[PDB]
Design a protein around this ligand. Sequence first.
Ligand code: XVS
Lengths: 99, 99
Amino acid sequence: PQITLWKRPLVTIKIGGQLKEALLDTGADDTVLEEMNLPGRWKPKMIGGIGGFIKVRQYDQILIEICGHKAIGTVLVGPTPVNVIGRNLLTQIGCTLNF
Amino acid sequence: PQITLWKRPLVTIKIGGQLKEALLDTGADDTVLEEMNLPGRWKPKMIGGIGGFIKVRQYDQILIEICGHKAIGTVLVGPTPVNVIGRNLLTQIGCTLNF
Ligand SMILES: CCOP(=O)(COc1ccc(C[C@H](NC(=O)O[C@H]2CO[C@H]3OCC[C@H]32)[C@H](O)CN(CC(CC)CC)S(=O)(=O)c2ccc(OC)cc2)cc1)OCC
């Protein structure tokens, strides 16, 4: 679809069999989700935002369906204020900015 | 134009008679720019993201040119690690997400 930005670009995602709401975030290099249980091995990592760095759990090669489009990539899980879909997965679904 | 997301969506902006590089950020409600000595009145504000909150100065009705597209709206100035163009201005230049 073509998504305007008068509202937050929120969409439904499916990860680990669970449905969630996430923000399509072109300013995020990576995808960061709120605390949740995901199956598989994970390694701790650090990511920095506008307010500093946080600790996250990094899951590699995770299946995630975004607004009907499938992606398989890295998903970070930690104390983010909102679920954000970052460029690592936006590229996979063919998302571009247009004006 | 069309901007792919393989790399950070950086573009040149013109604000306060200065040229800068800024991120087209669909995840940013508002526009946040690196410290700069803009004239006029301002009101204090706090904005939050990954890592917590930072203090910024809110300037209203500021003209910014983004890839030749003129826009006028609220600009937040503070110790942000990156210049981000938020939805308040992205809407004015007709920017959409497409996949
Ligand atoms: C690289 C230079 O230094 P740093 O590494 C960090 O630099 C940065 C800092 C910020 C950004 C932009 C930020 N992206 C981001 O957080 O992405 C994370 C995940 O993926 C990583 O990629 C880039 C960093 C990692 C979001 O697009 C927008 N944000 C909100 C969003 C938060 C997820 C939704 C709530 S917002 O900025 O907080 C914001 C809040 C309220 C506003 O209006 C009221 C306007 C803006 C990009 C690079 O370290 C500094 C210690």
